[PDB]
Design a protein around this ligand. Structure first.
Ligand SMILES: *[C@@H]1O[C@H](CO)[C@@H](O[C@@H]2O[C@H](CO)[C@@H](O[C@@H]3O[C@H](CO[C@H]4O[C@H](CO)[C@@H](O)[C@H](O)[C@@H]4O)[C@@H](O)[C@H](O[C@H]4O[C@H](CO)[C@@H](O)[C@H](O)[C@@H]4O)[C@@H]3O)[C@H](O)[C@H]2NC(C)=O)[C@H](O)[C@H]1NC(C)=O
Ligand SMILES: *[C@@H]1O[C@H](CO)[C@@H](O[C@@H]2O[C@H](CO)[C@@H](O[C@@H]3O[C@H](CO[C@H]4O[C@H](CO)[C@@H](O)[C@H](O)[C@@H]4O)[C@@H](O)[C@H](O[C@H]4O[C@H](CO)[C@@H](O)[C@H](O)[C@@H]4O)[C@@H]3O)[C@H](O)[C@H]2NC(C)=O)[C@H](O)[C@H]1NC(C)=O
Ligand SMILES: *[C@@H]1O[C@H](CO)[C@@H](O[C@@H]2O[C@H](CO)[C@@H](O[C@@H]3O[C@H](CO[C@H]4O[C@H](CO[C@H]5O[C@H](CO)[C@@H](O)[C@H](O)[C@@H]5O)[C@@H](O)[C@H](O)[C@@H]4O)[C@@H](O)[C@H](O)[C@@H]3O)[C@H](O)[C@H]2NC(C)=O)[C@H](O)[C@H]1NC(C)=O
Ligand SMILES: *[C@@H]1O[C@H](CO)[C@@H](O[C@@H]2O[C@H](CO)[C@@H](O[C@@H]3O[C@H](CO)[C@@H](O)[C@H](O)[C@@H]3O)[C@H](O)[C@H]2NC(C)=O)[C@H](O)[C@H]1NC(C)=O
Ligand SMILES: *[C@@H]1O[C@H](CO)[C@@H](O[C@@H]2O[C@H](CO)[C@@H](O[C@@H]3O[C@H](CO)[C@@H](O)[C@H](O)[C@@H]3O)[C@H](O)[C@H]2NC(C)=O)[C@H](O)[C@H]1NC(C)=O
Ligand SMILES: *[C@@H]1O[C@H](CO)[C@@H](O[C@@H]2O[C@H](CO)[C@@H](O[C@@H]3O[C@H](CO)[C@@H](O)[C@H](O)[C@@H]3O)[C@H](O)[C@H]2NC(C)=O)[C@H](O)[C@H]1NC(C)=O
Ligand SMILES: *[C@@H]1O[C@H](CO)[C@@H](O[C@@H]2O[C@H](CO)[C@@H](O[C@@H]3O[C@H](CO)[C@@H](O)[C@H](O)[C@@H]3O)[C@H](O)[C@H]2NC(C)=O)[C@H](O)[C@H]1NC(C)=O
Ligand SMILES: *[C@@H]1O[C@H](CO)[C@@H](O[C@@H]2O[C@H](CO)[C@@H](O)[C@H](O)[C@H]2NC(C)=O)[C@H](O)[C@H]1NC(C)=O
Ligand SMILES: *[C@@H]1O[C@H](CO)[C@@H](O[C@@H]2O[C@H](CO)[C@@H](O)[C@H](O)[C@H]2NC(C)=O)[C@H](O)[C@H]1NC(C)=O
Ligand SMILES: *[C@@H]1O[C@H](CO)[C@@H](O)[C@H](O)[C@H]1NC(C)=O
Ligand SMILES: *[C@@H]1O[C@H](CO)[C@@H](O)[C@H](O)[C@H]1NC(C)=O
Ligand SMILES: *[C@@H]1O[C@H](CO)[C@@H](O)[C@H](O)[C@H]1NC(C)=O
Ligand SMILES: *[C@@H]1O[C@H](CO)[C@@H](O)[C@H](O)[C@H]1NC(C)=O
Ligand SMILES: *[C@@H]1O[C@H](CO)[C@@H](O)[C@H](O)[C@H]1NC(C)=O
Ligand SMILES: *[C@@H]1O[C@H](CO)[C@@H](O)[C@H](O)[C@H]1NC(C)=O
Lengths: 106, 118, 144, 140, 107, 298, 122, 105
């Protein structure tokens, strides 16, 4: 599964809604896609597990959605603290795989 | 163990065939033990609930006391897929909920008001 | 693999050359003997099969040896008998009625895979060719 | 968890990175590793099963499943007496550099149609508690 | 079998969280459910976990948690000195058709 | 019993190495099965039967009999000269049978001599003997012998001759009446030491411990079944197993994957299956009540 | 919903003992009454239980040949007898309420109400 | 029986160069040969079957064949691995060997 994460490396003003896409090669079994936020210099933090469940301590700004092969992470009211590298990944039945990741810029 | 003809592919079911049905018109289906009557009320396929191993009604409320008047069908797939039976749960029902007696029968007989209105 | 020491005979004599397997686990492999001529030719002498305890149709009771070795009848023409002492004991190559032309270094080798039968008849199986020789011993010079 | 500090090696030798799974006992704490080469994304390296034979992902045997590039090249193991997870190389290559993250793994139970004997098994999960990431440098 | 839990809690100061583990086999701790009880010397024990959908009345959120497979645990968040009770792991045992209790963990 | 009762005439005219699976265990070939299985249909793809069950002589093909629907040839005497491996006969359990003369009972010849045969007289087991037998012949081909398969019938041309328990096509076609050879259900066969030699494509047949009761006798069987995790298993996919099952924990019976026994749960009289755990059946239903006969006061 | 035990006993080895729990504050028709033993410093030990009204009772195999329990329904009391003491039996004996099975059959109700505990000295 | 003709009989040191050795059978041997090295000591296996390197055999050894003639290629002879090299067959048996090919290295 070559998850391709290609919103294109978005550049947003703080307060705008980020729209991060993730395209699966095949269907994601059930909903085993997940999203992470990596601030430069830090280990990535889990944001969303499953297609949309929010992890503890994560702002409501982060909203996951999707099914089949079409998934996304939406960050409403994007804050300066969120201009990190985002990654989608998958934990399905054969293996664990990661996307390339993209950065939110201004 | 009853068999539904379905789509030409036969399969196992617990749904009572008409050949097993005995009935009362007061909402009760009496039947050969080993099945549960399914009633499609109008279209809804709604499964009746056993009160006794051979008797079922619409809601399990123990109602008070010839063409068949029930619209049964081999539909519903009744109690084929119950939830998991926990070892503890089985023991609990066999020790607590389950219960045959005679002293009880006598205590009940001695308390009948004899207002036998039926 | 460890073999016996050096030996010197006069013609008409017999020589017994031993080979003890280096491991403890037997896997239905075969041990063959190769003769090293002073002329640098290598002759296959012969070899046998050492069956693991669970093979040979024990399931049916009894035992069927995988036996036929395709003995060399070109230069040896009989004379050399190769047998195992037991499933765990050493292999012996009994070289009889020898001549000075049989001076050679003698050594054993274990093949890389289990021999597979090609045919079975009656109470015996006939081994197909042994696979490529793998683990070589060092050898003993036997002169006559 | 907390990871060990930075390490530098020459090609060959061996390298070990340890993780201290502090704050809780290993009741059911799974752990694994993720690699990030400088300028790159994340690579799953592998996970290890702290439990018994009942939970070995789906095949039902190996306690250590690895990503495709790590199939025997690197070892992942857990010392249950010291609550420590390890990632180890028995031959360090010049390419094995960058940040190695150690993280708690969160398995997801088996679903769909399966047999009784594997009912307690789990599928691959996700990574929840991440350590800080250690740096490995390999050079001549 | 017999449920196994440690003889003593990690303990520590108030404000600290500790975990009391419990384990067993599929014949008892696995499947079913695992009750947890609190007992102070001199009195009868009372319930904490796997009762009342794991939150019995009168018991604070301080005492909580559960585990999968054949594991179980009691997490105590904030070691108030009033909580220095022995804790017990209990489950239904399907071999003996009765209840099994673990050793008791002392906090 | 003595090993010289086993015929051992093995001739490698082709496919060198086939013989390996006789002497050695776990030396099966296991290759070319995707092609061989191309013609092995699911029970569901056969015409629905109806009417009374009859019987027919299963004079089937000479291709390798590696499919459950293959109709076995009626039994008769088989010469030892054509037999390489041991001969196994199936009653619910495997039976090893040996060589015989037409009249004398033992022939301790290893099957090498003439007039040395396998008797193989069979009539469905509630009376005696076996449902059918399987053995490897002298050139590496598996051959079978067995009871007449059931003539199930149907409306179309793709009707079935059933050697196994074909419940979903005809409700009365039980193993005890239609069985011939080792196939119990279209996806499960009785295991034995040479199963992977005689039926080499039965790789990944997860093994199950089951118990079957025929007539008055229990048989403890090793069942080998085709099952892949994730495989569809709806009610329409479940076959009758005719088992008297072993107990798992305290509440569940061990059944073959996607199958059921006809035995009712103790408390309800009903069959209760699990949706996700494919090979189990509950022995205890949950609903319960108070007997009403006990309170039918005059 | 209190269970009331009465007294405590001291007996020499080989002697029998008897404890009972009267209970009030509930109907005692909708739960089981369990007996649990605890030797000083030891584990809570399961002995067995009784179904009020029906009188149905089960015992741990450990005490199957040693104890019996009954209920005097109109007295709202469960009684337990130990045929003899063997030193190892010293400890506190409690009765407790086995609540319904959550009623909606979710997570079950464990033993929420315990009697004070009676002391048995061998 | 199966005869194997080994050629060249003797090869020069030709240090650092490539060299090949071959054997030609009287019979159509499948890819079941083996090659051995005998460096003044007891022999060791080089090639398993017509071309698989045996464990411990360096990359310098490789080969191909089938039919009647098989070739052992030894490349980069920087290490003067003196030996008489041998061709051995495992098709029909009693098993046979060629006479060996001496390489001066
Ligand atoms: C009791 O249990 C029985 C099973 O024993 C249930 O019955 C099944 O119900 C399902 C759902 O209605 C039926 O499936 C449907 O069959 C239609 C017709 O099948 C033909 O076409 C398909 C094409 O793929 C062929 O494979 C097949 O052989 C036939 O030629 C299909 O057209 C339906 O497809 C549509 O819905 C599905 C989702 O359900 C979508 O994925 C499709 O894209 C499409 O939109 C569907 O497959 C099934 O046939 C029934 N089986 C039997 C034996 O009757 C009962 O419903 C259940 N009852 C209760 C109360 O629980
Ligand atoms: C589960 O559901 C299936 C339907 O899906 C039922 O199957 C049908 O069962 C009936 C009753 O047995 C079958 O009817 C009979 O078919 C025979 C076959 O003839 C075919 O070919 C002729 C032309 O030569 C056609 O005319 C005929 O329609 C068929 O296509 C007939 O020989 C039988 O004839 C007898 O009855 C008729 C009355 O109908 C008399 O006039 C005749 O003289 C004679 O006595 C009869 O017609 C039907 O074919 C089956 N259909 C299918 C698709 O298989 C199952 O019975 C039902 N089962 C359960 C619960 O078990
Ligand atoms: C019992 O169960 C075992 C499994 O445990 C079964 O064995 C497997 O059987 C299947 C079907 O025959 C084998 O699949 C075949 O493999 C052929 C060669 O393998 C190589 O190519 C495969 C496919 O490569 C393409 O696809 C991948 C994935 O996207 C891409 O990365 C590649 O670039 C290619 O585009 C690879 O997956 C494999 O690793 C090899 O490289 C192939 O040519 C066939 O088309 C088919 O794919 C499978 O390999 C067997 N598994 C093993 C371990 O041997 C066994 O059959 C079961 N028994 C019975 C009776 O059914
Ligand atoms: C099993 O037996 C019951 C007996 O009650 C059968 O129910 C009866 O079925 C007939 C024929 O379908 C009904 O007549 C029809 O009723 C429907 C509405 O329900 C109407 O749309 C039709 O036009 C027609 O009038 C009859 O009313 C019905 N009885 C009752 C009480 O509803 C049932 O069909 C049998 N099922 C089988 C075939 O096994
Ligand atoms: C073990 O069970 C599996 C699952 O039932 C078997 O796989 C099935 O094999 C058949 C035979 O080739 C496949 O049927 C064919 O499908 C093609 C279309 O792709 C069609 O053109 C052919 O006419 C035929 O119908 C079937 O699809 C396949 N099922 C699945 C889910 O892949 C397997 O063969 C069994 N193994 C053994 C050794 O019996
Ligand atoms: C072991 O089983 C195999 C598989 O069935 C047997 O192979 C079959 O052998 C017969 C007799 O040689 C062949 O029959 C002949 O076919 C040719 C076709 O051109 C025909 O002209 C002859 O008059 C005769 O009918 C049959 O084709 C062949 N079948 C297959 C699938 O290979 C084999 O003989 C059995 N071994 C023993 C010892 O019985
Ligand atoms: C079950 O019982 C008997 C004894 O095992 C077997 O019947 C015998 O079958 C053989 C052929 O395999 C018969 O041999 C030949 O029969 C023909 C008949 O026309 C005759 O012309 C020949 O000269 C030769 O005798 C044998 O007679 C026959 N014996 C009897 C008394 O029936 C048979 O194997 C088994 N029955 C089956 C086929 O299910
Ligand atoms: C058990 O098997 C069923 C299929 O028989 C699974 O399929 C469905 O899963 C979705 C998930 O969103 C549910 O909403 C459906 O209700 C399920 N189908 C049925 C018939 O219930 C289900 O996921 C499997 N469950 C487990 C635990 O494995
Ligand atoms: C399993 O049997 C097949 C034959 O059915 C073997 O395939 C043959 O392999 C030889 C190798 O020299 C080829 O010459 C044949 O042409 C092949 N036959 C065909 C048509 O497949 C296969 O090698 C055997 N595998 C094992 C495990 O021995
Ligand atoms: C079933 O009957 C109800 C009630 O009249 C009606 O609303 C509905 O359209 C019917 N169809 C369904 C949902 O089966
Ligand atoms: C077949 O058997 C005969 C008789 O024993 C034998 O002469 C012949 O060589 C055998 N064929 C093969 C291929 O082994
Ligand atoms: C089936 O074969 C046997 C062989 O003994 C024969 O007696 C019987 O008549 C045959 N039956 C049919 C229906 O052909
Ligand atoms: C089996 O046959 C062999 C043939 O060599 C014979 O030596 C042996 O005595 C026989 N076994 C029996 C029947 O005791
Ligand atoms: C073969 O069996 C017959 C008995 O039918 C016997 O007379 C004959 O001597 C036997 N032949 C051999 C070679 O064993
Ligand atoms: C059965 O009839 C169909 C046409 O309906 C035909 O295509 C098929 O070939 C016939 N039977 C077989 C299996 O040959």
């Amino acid at each position: 599964l070559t998850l391709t994460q290609s919103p294109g490396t978005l550049s947003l003003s703080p307060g705008e809604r980020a729209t991060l896409s993730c395209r699966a090669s095949q269907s994601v079994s059930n909903n085993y896609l997940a999203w992470y936020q990596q601030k430069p210099g830090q280990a990535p933090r889990l944001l969303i597990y499953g297609a949309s469940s929010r992890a503890t301590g994560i702002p409501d700004r982060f909203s996951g959605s999707g099914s089949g092969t079409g998934f996304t992470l939406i960050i409403s009211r994007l804050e300066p603290e969120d201009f990190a590298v985002y990654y989608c990944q998958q934990y399905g039945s054969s293996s664990i795989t990661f996307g390339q990741g993209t950065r939110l810029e201004i | 163990y009853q068999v539904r003809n379905s789509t030409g592919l036969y399969h196992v079911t617990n749904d009572c065939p008409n050949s097993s049905i005995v009935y009362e018109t007061a909402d009760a289906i009496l039947h050969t033990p080993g099945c549960v009557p399914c009633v499609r009320e109008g279209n809804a396929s709604r499964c009746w609930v056993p009160m006794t191993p051979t008797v079922a009604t619409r809601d399990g409320k123990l109602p008070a006391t010839s063409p068949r008047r029930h619209w049964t069908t081999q539909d519903c797939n009744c109690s084929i897929y119950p939830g998991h039976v926990t070892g503890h749960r089985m023991a609990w029902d066999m020790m607590m909920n389950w219960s045959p007696t005679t002293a009880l029968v006598v205590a009940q007989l001695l308390r009948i008001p004899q207002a036998i209105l039926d | 693999l460890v073999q016996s020491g050096a030996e010197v005979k006069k013609p008409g004599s017999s020589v017994r050359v031993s080979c003890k397997a280096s491991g403890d686990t037997f896997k239905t492999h075969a041990i063959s003997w190769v003769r090293q001529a002073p002329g640098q030719g290598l002759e296959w002498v012969g070899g046998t099969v050492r069956q693991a305890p669970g093979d040979g149709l024990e399931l049916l009771g009894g035992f069927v040896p995988i036996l036929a070795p395709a003995n060399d009848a070109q230069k040896f023409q009989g004379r050399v008998t190769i047998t195992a002492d037991g499933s765990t004991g050493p292999v012996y190559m009994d070289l009889s009625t020898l001549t000075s032309e049989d001076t050679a270094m003698y050594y054993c080798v274990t093949s890389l895979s289990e021999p597979i039968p090609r045919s079975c008849r009656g109470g015996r199986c006939y081994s197909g060719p042994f696979d490529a020789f793998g683990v070589w011993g060092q050898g003993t010079l036997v002169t006559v | 968890l907390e990871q060990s500090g930075p390490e530098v090696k020459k090609p060959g030798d061996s390298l070990r990175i340890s993780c201290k799974m502090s704050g809780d006992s290993l009741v059911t704490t799974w752990i694994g590793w993720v690699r990030q080469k400088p300028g790159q994304g994340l690579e799953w390296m592998g996970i290890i099963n702290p439990g018994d034979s009942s939970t070995n992902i789906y095949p039902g045997d190996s306690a250590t499943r690895y990503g495709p590039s790590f199939q025997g090249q690197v070892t992942i193991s857990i010392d249950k007496s010291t609550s420590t997870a390890y990632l180890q190389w028995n031959n360090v290559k010049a390419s094995d550099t960058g940040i190695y993250y150690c993280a708690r793994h969160v398995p997801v139970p088996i679903s769909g149609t399966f047999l009784w004997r594997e009912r307690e098994m789990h599928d691959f999960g996700y990574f929840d508690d991440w350590g800080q990431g250690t740096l490995v440098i390999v050079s001549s | 079998s017999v449920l196994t839990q440690p003889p003593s809690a990690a303990s520590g100061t108030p404000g600290q969280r500790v975990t009391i583990s419990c384990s067993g086999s599929s014949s008892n701790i696995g499947g079913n459910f695992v009750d947890w009880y609190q007992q102070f010397p001199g009195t009868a024990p009372k319930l904490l976990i796997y009762t009342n959908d794991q939150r019995p009345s009168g018991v604070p959120a301080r005492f909580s948690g559960s585990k999968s497979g054949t594991s179980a645990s009691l997490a105590i968040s904030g070691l108030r000195s009033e909580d220095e009770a022995d804790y017990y792991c209990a489950a239904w045992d399907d071999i003996v058709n009765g209840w099994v209790f673990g050793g008791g963990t002392k906090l | 019993w003595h090993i010289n009762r086993t015929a051992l005439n093995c001739n490698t005219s082709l496919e060198t190495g086939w013989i390996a699976g006789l002497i050695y265990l776990n030396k099966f070939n296991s290759s070319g099965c995707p092609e061989r299985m191309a013609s092995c249909r699911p029970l569901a793809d056969f015409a629905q039967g109806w009417g009374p069950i009859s019987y027919a002589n299963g004079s089937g093909p000479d291709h390798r009999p590696y499919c459950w629907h293959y109709p076995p040839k009626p039994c008769g005497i088989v010469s030892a000269k054509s037999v390489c491996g041991p001969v196994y006969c199936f009653t619910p359990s495997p039976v090893v049978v040996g060589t015989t003369n037409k009249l004398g009972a033992p022939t301790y010849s290893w099957g090498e001599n003439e007039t040395d045969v396998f008797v193989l007289n069979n009539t469905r087991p509630p009376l005696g003997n076996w449902f059918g037998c399987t053995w490897m012949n002298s050139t590496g081909f598996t051959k079978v012998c067995g009871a007449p398969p059931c003539a199930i019938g149907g409306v179309g041309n793709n009707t079935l001759h059933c050697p196994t328990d074909c419940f979903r096509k005809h409700p009365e076609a039980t193993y005890s009446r239609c069985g011939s050879g080792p196939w119990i259900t279209p996806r499960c066969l009785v295991d034995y030491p040479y199963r992977l030699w005689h039926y080499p494509c039965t790789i990944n047949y997860t093994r199950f411990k089951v118990r079957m009761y025929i007539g008055g006798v229990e048989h403890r069987l090793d069942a080998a079944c085709n099952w892949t995790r994730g495989e569809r298993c709806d009610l329409e996919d479940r076959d009758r197993s005719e088992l008297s099952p072993l107990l798992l924990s305290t509440t569940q019976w061990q059944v073959l994957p996607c199958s059921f026994t006809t035995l009712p749960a103790l408390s309800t009289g009903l069959i209760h299956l699990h949706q996700n755990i494919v090979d189990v059946q509950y022995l205890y239903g949950v609903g319960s009540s108070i007997v009403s006969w006990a309170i039918k006061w005059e | 919903v209190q269970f009331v035990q009465s007294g405590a006993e001291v007996k020499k080895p080989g002697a029998s003992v008897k404890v009972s729990c009267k209970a009030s504050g509930y109907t005692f028709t909708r739960h089981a009454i369990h007996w649990v033993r605890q030797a000083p410093g030891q584990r809570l030990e399961w002995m067995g239980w009784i179904n009020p009204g029906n009188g149905n009772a089960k015992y741990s195999q450990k005490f199957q040949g040693r104890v019996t329990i009954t209920r005097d329904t109109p007295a709202s009391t469960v009684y337990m007898e130990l045929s003899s003491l063997r030193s190892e039996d010293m400890g506190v004996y409690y009765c407790a309420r086995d609540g319904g099975y959550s009623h909606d059959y979710s997570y079950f109700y464990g033993l929420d109400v315990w009697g004070p505990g009676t002391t048995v000295i061998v």
